[PDB]
Amino acid sequence: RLYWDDLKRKLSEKLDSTDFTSTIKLLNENSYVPREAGSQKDENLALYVENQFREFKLSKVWRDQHFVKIQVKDSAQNSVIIVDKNGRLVYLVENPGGYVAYSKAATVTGKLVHANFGTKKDFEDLYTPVNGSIVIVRAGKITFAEKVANAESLNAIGVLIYMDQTKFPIVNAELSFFGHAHLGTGDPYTPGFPSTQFPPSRSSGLPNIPVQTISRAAAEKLFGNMEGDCPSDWKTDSTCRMVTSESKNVKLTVSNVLKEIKILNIFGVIKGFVEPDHYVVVGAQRDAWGPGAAKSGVGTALLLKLAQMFSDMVLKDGFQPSRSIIFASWSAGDFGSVGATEWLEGYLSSLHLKAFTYINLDKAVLGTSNFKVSASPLLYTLIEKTMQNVKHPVTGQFLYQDSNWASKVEKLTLDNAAFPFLAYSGIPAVSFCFCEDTDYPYLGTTMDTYKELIERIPELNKVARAAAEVAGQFVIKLTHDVELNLDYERYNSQLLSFVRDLNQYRADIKEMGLSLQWLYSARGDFFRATSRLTTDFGNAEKTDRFVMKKLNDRVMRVEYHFLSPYVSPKESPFRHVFWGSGSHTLPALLENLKLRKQNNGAFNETLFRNQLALATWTIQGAANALSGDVWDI
Amino acid sequence: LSFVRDLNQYRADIKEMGLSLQWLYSARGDFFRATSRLTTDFGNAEKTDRFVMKKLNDRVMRVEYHFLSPYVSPKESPFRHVFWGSGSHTLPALLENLKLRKQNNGAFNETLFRNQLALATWTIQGAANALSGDVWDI
Amino acid sequence: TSQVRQNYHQDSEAAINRQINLELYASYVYLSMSYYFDRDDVALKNFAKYFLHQSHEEREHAEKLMKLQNQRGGRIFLQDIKKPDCDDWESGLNAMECALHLEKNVNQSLLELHKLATDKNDPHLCDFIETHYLNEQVKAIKELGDHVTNLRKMGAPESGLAEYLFDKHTLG
Amino acid sequence: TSQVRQNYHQDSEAAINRQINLELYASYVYLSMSYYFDRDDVALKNFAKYFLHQSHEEREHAEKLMKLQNQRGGRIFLQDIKKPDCDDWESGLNAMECALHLEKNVNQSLLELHKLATDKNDPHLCDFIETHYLNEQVKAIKELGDHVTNLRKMGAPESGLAEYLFDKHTLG
Amino acid sequence: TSQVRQNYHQDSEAAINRQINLELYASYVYLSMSYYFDRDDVALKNFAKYFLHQSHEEREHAEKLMKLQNQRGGRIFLQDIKKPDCDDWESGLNAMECALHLEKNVNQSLLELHKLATDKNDPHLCDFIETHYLNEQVKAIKELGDHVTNLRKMGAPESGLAEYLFDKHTLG
């Protein structure tokens, strides 16, 4: 067993002589260049990664194979067409190079209406009714899946998406791009039974309208046939317009088809010396529509180098992780973390007893200016201590520069592989990156190349190196300390913050005959439960692996006990009342209640009483799950 | 065994529906393996080492719960135990739906069965996987 | 519906309108290139003549597509002709490289058009594209490739002598 | 500054660029008009021929202005060529009326250009406009006026016979 | 990769090289046949002239394919030209029958080439094969069939008089 100081030094010095750019460049070679999930090139890289793991001599390397239905574009072209309502003659504007996976295959003709980013707010602020019209929106702010849903929610009949030059200062205006519009993760077409025969989807999160990505040039050509200046508030090109002329409307034809593919998740593992049946999981997306250097290459490179380093530290330098470290190369990430989700779904309710943390490595390097982090609050302390002794690659200062960084942390979103881990599986998760206030413009394009990457970021090797150090320090701390570096006390602030918000309606809870007393008591009981647990840790003999196991297991279950037990994972997979999606999340409870200031019928008093109940029960349950022995109350 | 033994009394009707029972047999096999490994582990454990026993005992303590179907809400159907609970998610329900296929009456529900078959298989696999221990042991 | 229309898909009609615009755009690019070489500070008269001829050929290409649209009973829909990507074409070599890129883009559009015509089982339109456009594009691309190669081998763009002599011997 | 430039005001240079765009626009209007008459449901081949010729003349007008810009040491700056105001020109008479309006607009632009050249004491530019443009516009406007008059007197646009016979006798 | 290459599959490139060899082989077969009829013990000068012309046509066919390879940015790869199957062609009739068999073999190769071009969605290559090769093969095969028929009906190969008169009337 080594000292944390030595492990820190060892990791750092191994990192110093590590060549990241070579690997990123290597992954950008023609053997791997265009690696859409399931393709032979994806399969090539999968084989290469797998071989590398074998050369690193990890305890065991294996395959997690899955068959899934994705959507690819048909031999028939998707098309964007302008129609003259006079005589109904059509003019072809574009056959897009790209497409949007999970779009309804259909042909729709209507008026075209701009809706900015297609955010929920953008739609309400519209002075043009979207109903029965095709909508065009800029990429960014929110996922394609959300834009489609918001629009579909207002009865739009189709969606176009372009990259405006203000948000995406790309010189080539003919650039086409890719994404998906499945409002979830995993395979949307997952019949619980094999079939020839065709069953409907139900609560799939799939679009019922066609959605399609277009080049900025094609959008500006559409603007050429539209009227109305865009609000300066949108801060967009002067090109932009709002609505088709009276005599014209647009026709969209999407003919994407379902294809079944064989994806491979490639796994390596360094077994733990004390509790090998518990793991930290480190993963990266291996697939990409185009070259996907930043989208896929960076992550996969870090995955490979981290795997190599840790294998060397165990075999040469005497590092002895208490718990196991699993390295995961995912496929079909581009379709909604499909690879990751399929694997997660094998262990719906059991995984949280083995995996205590997931570290995502996707898009860790996109810029230089900033260091962003999204994570479970359970990892805020680990993250903080890690930023306090990792240096900025350009700047030289420690990453930790703001004592208040934790309150400004944004939550994991659906397009992040870290999301299903936390919100569906109840495993604390963290994603982080070096970046700007600007999205990396080339993501999802054929311009996401190494050359492009090394050009916007000439210090690529140093920056990737800093990204590896944070992930590496995470992984060491997590498998070295006898306690788990999961700060369960953090959820007191979260509950406090939530009740603090809720208490801004102590009046409206009166006019409904409701007391919030049982909820306050749940919050109090959780506080007590954490306090008792901290005391127990302090009074425990750190060398007694039996008592530590028992205390650590309690910590490992905190996250999962915030998954609502009162909703089916099939109907709503994202059960986490803090971080998931649906009417069972604390945020939903607040939004339903904010709709009570308006005397409009949007408020749903009944729903709220149920939400209040389920929240209280969930929180009580978590407090009770943490308290320990049934005679201690 | 008893349950599959019963189910196998329809290996014909599973043909006329384009279905294989192969993934279910494999789940049953995997559970068998998982228990065998666990018994071996107990035998090889030092009965005086409360840490290793804790770990093995905790695995035993979770067997029962992993037969609660993870695919049904406890509010809609509280009795989730696929052996002992109530509803369309229990193994018995799967059999009863299938026994309704000898009558050419519309009571049989082929679609439901394919879902039942799936959920059962998944539940059983999950339990086998939950019992196997360390993820590198497979 | 037009009394002459037969086996002519609305998608093909629209694609023909898009191609008309592209041909007109190509005409405009070549017009711009031509007069760049007519500048007193560039002064390569045979480059200017070569590109002006290419410009006029593209107008003929556009006109033939407009004729085709009417022949098949489709309706011509025109859009703005975008200005060329560049104002200053830098050198004879750079202009040739831009022309090569342009002709390859136009070819790709024509191949997409042919794929559509094939998908809609329109053999008349397939034959029209093959006869009047596809080999013309292959010849144009080959010629521009040859020109680029010669200019590079001669030492362009650095060698003003190279572009001068190419102007006289190849384009004269 | 260009080694050839002399007595050529920056305002004149800009105005010449605007005129180049207008000439190209006029070429496009006439191109659109021409193919309208080539439609199977319009089918007046001499109207089509007449307007196609007018279109080609406008391209020549644009080219001569581009030549002038370079002759004087100005720099050509191109902008998008806007699509014509109309897709369906309705009748022979209506197309002639649109052409008349177009040529009068172009003439007004040329007169404004001449006024600028006069204000900047540029007699070479004045003479260029007078020689190559002003009388051509007067002749074009007079011809279109004559055509409109004849079509009206013959009974157009209601009389399909009038436009048919005008197509044969005046434009044939 | 060649700066001109576009939509040209490596399989098509290879197939074009194989076709070049076949055309050269056909040229050689016809050259051999020609000089057989120039032997003092055969002495049919119009058979000799006919086959020599056919030989030269095949060289032209090969050259056009070499041109095509370069036009599309492929690279010519040559192989040995195999000697013809026969040294002594026996009679005018037998030579015609061999030529018929040869042209049908060449046609089959061209049809396989077209099938490949179709599979790779290469309409330029399809059109090239159709335009320059497929009907030429159909005409050649028909002509040779006609010749074989006439020689048989006249009494060849037994009748030396038949081949003599065919030489004068059909090939003269």
Structure tokens at D58: 């406008």
Residue C123, preceding bond cis, omega within 30 degrees?
no
Our CA-based measurement puts residue C8 at a distance from the nearest CA of chain D, in whole angstroms, of 15
Which residues are bridge partners to A262 per DSSP?
Answer: A67
Contact E124 C104 (CB under 8 A): no
**How far is it, in rounded angstroms, from Cα A475 to Cα A469?**
10
Residues 6+ apart with CB under 8 A from A340: A185, A265, A283, A328, A330, A333, A417, A420, A421
- Residue pair D20/D76 in contact (Cβ under 8 Å)? The answer is yes
CB < 8 Å to D36, chain C: 76
Q: Is A63 on the interface with B (CB under 8 A)?
A: no
Closest by CA to A560, choosing from B135, B122, B65, is B65
Q: Give chains near B: 3+ CB pairs under 8 A.
A: A
Q: Is A625 on the interface with B (CB under 8 A)?
A: no
Residue A150 DSSP SS3:
helix
**Segment A410-414 long-range contacts (CB within 8 Å, at least 24 positions apart):** A410/A372, A410/A374, A411/A374, A411/A579, A412/A374, A412/A375, A412/A579, A413/A143, A413/A374, A414/A143, A414/A145, A414/A146, A414/A183, A414/A184, A414/A185, A414/A336, A414/A581
Q: Which residue, chain included where needed, has tokens 């042209």?
A: E103
Q: What sign does the CA torsion over A312, A317, A320, A323 have?
A: negative
DSSP A41: H
- Residue pair B93/B69 in contact (Cβ under 8 Å)? The answer is no
Residue B26, φ and ψ in degrees, nearest 5? -65, -35
DSSP A405: G
User: Range of D77's domain?
Assistant: 1-172
Is D61 flagged in the annotation as binding? yes
Q: What sign does the CA torsion over A435, A441, A444, A445 have?
A: negative
**How far is it, in rounded angstroms, from Cα A483 to Cα A444?**
41
DSSP C63: H
Closest by CA to A417, choosing from A364, A495, A338, A346, is A338
Among candidates C18, C80, C119 on the partner chain, residue whose Cβ is nearest the Cβ of A92? C18
Among candidates C115, C142, C149 on the partner chain, residue whose Cβ is nearest the Cβ of E71? C142
Residues 6+ apart with CB under 8 A from D149: none
User: What ranges in A486-544 are assigned the alpha helix state H?
Assistant: 490-502, 517-539
Our CA-based measurement puts residue C113 at a distance from the nearest CA of chain A, in whole angstroms, of 10
**How far is it, in rounded angstroms, from Cα A479 to Cα A245?**
63
CB pairs under 8 A between C and D: 79
Is D69 flagged in the annotation as binding? no
The CATH number for D37's domain is 1.20.1260.10
- Residue pair A142/A117 in contact (Cβ under 8 Å)? The answer is yes
**Residue C101 CA neighbour count, 13 Å, CB half:** 9
Query: What are the DSSP E strand ranges found in A79-142?
Result: 79-84, 89-94, 100-101, 106-110, 112-114, 134-138
Residue A125 DSSP SS3:
coil
Closest by CA to A162, choosing from A209, A221, A245, A111, is A221
Query: For residues D62-78, b (16+ Cβ closer than 10 Å) or e, as one string?
Result: bbebbebbbebbbebeb
Closest by CA to A277, choosing from A385, A351, A210, A360, is A351
End-to-end CA distance of chain C: 51
Closest by CA to A53, choosing from A42, A62, A64, is A62
Does CATH number 1.20.930.40 belong to domain A491-632?
Answer: yes
Q: State the resolution, in angstroms.
A: 5.5
Chain breaks in chain C (C to N over 2.5 A) after: none
Among candidates B18, B58, B70 on the partner chain, residue whose Cβ is nearest the Cβ of A348? B70
Residue A6 DSSP SS3:
helix
CB < 8 Å to E70, chain C: 142
DSSP A559: G
Among candidates C3, C28, C70 on the partner chain, residue whose Cβ is nearest the Cβ of D35? C70
Q: Which residue, chain included where needed, has tokens 């290559």?
A: E125
Note whether B touches D: 3 CB pairs or more under 8 A.
Answer: no
Contact B129 A348 (CB under 8 A): no
Residue A428, preceding bond cis, omega within 30 degrees?
no
Query: Which residue type is seen at A595?
Result: L
CB < 8 Å to D68, chain C: none
Structure tokens at C46: 């045979």
Note whether C touches E: 3 CB pairs or more under 8 A.
Answer: yes
**Residue A444 CA neighbour count, 13 Å, CB half:** 28
HEC sequence for B39-78: HHHHHHCCCCCHHHHHHHHHHHHHHHHHHECCCCCCCCCC
CB < 8 Å to D24, chain C: 28, 81
**How far is it, in rounded angstroms, from Cα A151 to Cα A135?**
7
CA separation, residue B2 to residues A587, B5, B95, D63 (Å) = 47, 5, 12, 93
Q: Which residues of C are annotated as a binding site?
A: 23, 58, 61, 103, 137
Angle E45-72/E160-169 helices, nearest 10 degrees?
60
Residue A71, φ and ψ in degrees, nearest 5? -120, 135
Among candidates A199, A269, A350 on the partner chain, residue whose Cβ is nearest the Cβ of B66? A350
Closest by CA to A69, choosing from A340, A255, A335, is A335
In chain A, where does the domain assigned CATH 3.40.630.10 lie?
A: 1-74+257-490
CA separation, residue E18 to residues A337, C132, E106 (Å) = 48, 28, 11
Structure tokens at A139: 């990429």
Residue A101 DSSP SS3:
strand
Is D6 flagged in the annotation as binding? no
Closest by CA to A548, choosing from D116, B101, E58, B50, is B50
**Structure-solving method:** cryo-EM
DSSP per-residue string spanning D20-88: HHHHHHHHHHHHHHHHHTTSTTT--HHHHHHHHHHHHHHHHHHHHHHHHHHHHT-------BPPPS-S-
C-alpha angle A350/A356/A360, rounded to 5°?
110
Closest by CA to A257, choosing from A149, A101, A152, A144, is A101
Q: Cα C135 vs. chain centroid, distance in angstroms?
A: 13
Q: Is A201 on the interface with B (CB under 8 A)?
A: no
CB < 8 Å to A89, chain C: 10, 13-14, 74-75, 77
**How far is it, in rounded angstroms, from Cα A254 to Cα A258?**
13
DSSP per-residue string spanning chain B: -HHHHHHGGGTTTTTTTT---HHHHHHHHHHHHHHHHHHHHHHHS-TT-HHHHHHHHHHHHHHGGGGB-TTS-TTT-S--BTTTS-STTSHHHHHHHHHTTSS-STT--HHHHHHHHHHHHHHHHHHHHHHS-STT--
Among candidates A279, A565, A569 on the partner chain, residue whose Cβ is nearest the Cβ of B135? A279
How many other CB atoms sit within 10 Å of the CB of residue E79?
A: 11
Domain A77-254 maps to which CATH number in 3.40.50.620, 3.10.20.310, 3.30.1360.120, 3.50.30.30? 3.50.30.30
Tell the CATH topology of A1-74+257-490.
Answer: Aminopeptidase (3.40.630)
Our CA-based measurement puts residue C2 at a distance from the nearest CA of chain D, in whole angstroms, of 8
Residue A70, φ and ψ in degrees, nearest 5? -110, 175
Which residues are bridge partners to C56 per DSSP?
Answer: none
Q: Which residue, chain included where needed, has tokens 């998908």?
A: C119
Structure tokens at D113: 């250009």
Structure tokens at A472: 């590496």
Burial of D12 (0-12, 13-18, 19+ CB in 10 A): buried
Structure tokens at C4: 């002459």
DSSP A365: B
Query: For residues E103-133, b (16+ Cβ closer than 10 Å) or e, as one string?
Result: beebbebbeebbebbeebebbbbbbbbeeeb
User: What ranges in chain E are assigned the alpha helix state H?
Assistant: 10-36, 45-72, 92-119, 123-129, 135-154, 160-169
Query: What are the DSSP E strand ranges found in C3-158?
Result: none
Contact D81 C80 (CB under 8 A): yes
Residue D118 DSSP SS3:
helix
Our CA-based measurement puts residue C138 at a distance from the nearest CA of chain E, in whole angstroms, of 7
Residues 6+ apart with CB under 8 A from E146: none
How, if at all, do strands A355-360 and A429-435 pair?
parallel
Closest by CA to C21, choosing from A240, D81, D86, is D81
Among candidates A79, A91, A253 on the partner chain, residue whose Cβ is nearest the Cβ of C77? A91
Q: Give chains near C: 3+ CB pairs under 8 A.
A: A, D, E
- Residue pair A552/A511 in contact (Cβ under 8 Å)? The answer is no
Note whether C touches D: 3 CB pairs or more under 8 A.
Answer: yes
Is E61 flagged in the annotation as binding? yes
Structure tokens at A160: 């176009």
CB pairs under 8 A between A and C: 47
**How far is it, in rounded angstroms, from Cα D71 to Cα A253?**
51
Q: Which residue, chain included where needed, has tokens 């904010």?
A: A594
CATH number of B1-137: 1.20.930.40
Name residues 71-130 of chain B within 8 A of A (Cβ): 71-76, 111, 113-119, 122, 125-126, 129-130
Residues 6+ apart with CB under 8 A from A19: A461
Residue A19 DSSP SS3:
coil
How many other CB atoms sit within 10 Å of the CB of residue D10?
A: 9
Residue of B129, B131, B135 to mutate when probing chain A, most A C-beta within 10 A: B135
Contact C104 E70 (CB under 8 A): no
Query: Which residue type is seen at A451?
Result: K
**How far is it, in rounded angstroms, from Cα A195 to Cα D41?**
55
Our CA-based measurement puts residue C172 at a distance from the nearest CA of chain D, in whole angstroms, of 20
- Residue pair C157/C164 in contact (Cβ under 8 Å)? The answer is no
